[PDB]
Amino acid sequence: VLQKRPVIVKVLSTTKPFEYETPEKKIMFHATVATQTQFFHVKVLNTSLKEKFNGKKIIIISDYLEYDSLLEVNEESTVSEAGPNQTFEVPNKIINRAKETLKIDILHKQASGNIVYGVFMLHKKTVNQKTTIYEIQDDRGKMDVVGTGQCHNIPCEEGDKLQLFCFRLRKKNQMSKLISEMHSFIQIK
Numbered sequence: 618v619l620q621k622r623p624v625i626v627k628v629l630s631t632t633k634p635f636e637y638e639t640p641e642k643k644i645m646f647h648a649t650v651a652t653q654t655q656f657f658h659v660k661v662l663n664t665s666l667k668e669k670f671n672g673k674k675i676i677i678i679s680d681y682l683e684y685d686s687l688l689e690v691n692e693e694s695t696v697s698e699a700g701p702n703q704t705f706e707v708p709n710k711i712i713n714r715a716k717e718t719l720k721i722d723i724l725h726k727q728a729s730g731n732i733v734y735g736v737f738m739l740h741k742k743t744v745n746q747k748t749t750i751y752e753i754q755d756d757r758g759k760m761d762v763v764g765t766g767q768c769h770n771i772p773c774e775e776g777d778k779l780q781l782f783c784f785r786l787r788k789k790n791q792m793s794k795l796i797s798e799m800h801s802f803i804q805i806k
Contacts, residue, residue, distance in 0.1 A: 623679035624688075625699055626650035626657070627707050628672040629715055632782065634664050635802055638766035646670070647782045647802055649715050650678075650688075651707040656715035658687040658734060660783065660800050666696050675699040685732040687783070721758035729788035733795055736780050736806050737762075744770050751803075753779065753795075761794045768797035771804075778806040 632647045648659040648670050659678075661670060669676055677697045682689040690696065718735030719727070737753035749769045751762040762784065764771070773779060782802040784795040797803075 618682070619680050619693065620683045620688075621679070623677045624650070624652065624657070624681075625675060625677050625703055625705075626652055627675050627705070628670050629656070629707070629712060631661075631670050631672070632802060632804065634667065635767060637799060637802075639799060645800065650676075651711050651715060653705050653707055654711070656711055658783070660687060660689045662689065662691040663694065666690065669696045669698070675704055677703075687732065721753070721755050721760050723757075724760060724786065725758060725793050727786055727793070729786060729793070731786045733784045733786050734782055736778050739773055739775055739777050739779050741775065742773065751779065762797070763794060764797045764801075764803060766797065766799070768801050768803050773805055780804050780806045 627650065629649045629651050634644050634646045636642055636644055644664045645660060645662045646664065646667065648661050650657050650659055677699050678690060678694065680694045718737065724733065738755065739751060740754040740759055741752040743750040747765060747769065749764040751764060753760055753762055781795065783798065783800050785798050787794055787796045
């Protein structure tokens with residue numbers, strides 16, 4: 618359901634556009650945005666909005682979808698440059714928070730179905746025909762990451778830090794793992 622209330626945000630980061638696999642091939646990019654008081658992850662499904670998300674100006678986003686604790690900006694959304702008098706600076710506390718990664722022991726206790734973003738060091742990688750199993754690790758634990766589609770077979774080595782966008786935390790058979798989904802993305806940090 619289209620969210621009405623426009624958000625006036627500073628764009629803190631974006632990915633480059635990337636190709637994803639639908640249940641057909643389309644292009645999107647990920648973005649992180651902030652007000653003076655909070656941060657949001659944004660799935661930008663309309664790549665023609667790339668320039669508005671370059672982060673040189675403050676923007677106003679309306680007609681977006683909101684679910685999974687994030688915003689979806691698509692072809693039905695409207696994105697505009699904020700007027701002269703609507704400029705603000707976002708506090709360092711919020712920029713820092715937007716970049717926080719949960720510890721893996723904490724993730725192991727998190728509710729099934731939650732979306733996860735973060736930076737995790739790669740321990741081990743198993744490349745199969747269709748799917749890749751990335752074993753990520755920190756001082757507190759390890760977890761399997763299951764990548765299919767654009768998250769299958771990303772070049773990386775042991776020691777590399779992996780930046781994950783939009784993964785699904787899944788508990789099945791007494792074990793928790795991150796599963797890539799349609800809009801997920803991995804890059805080396």
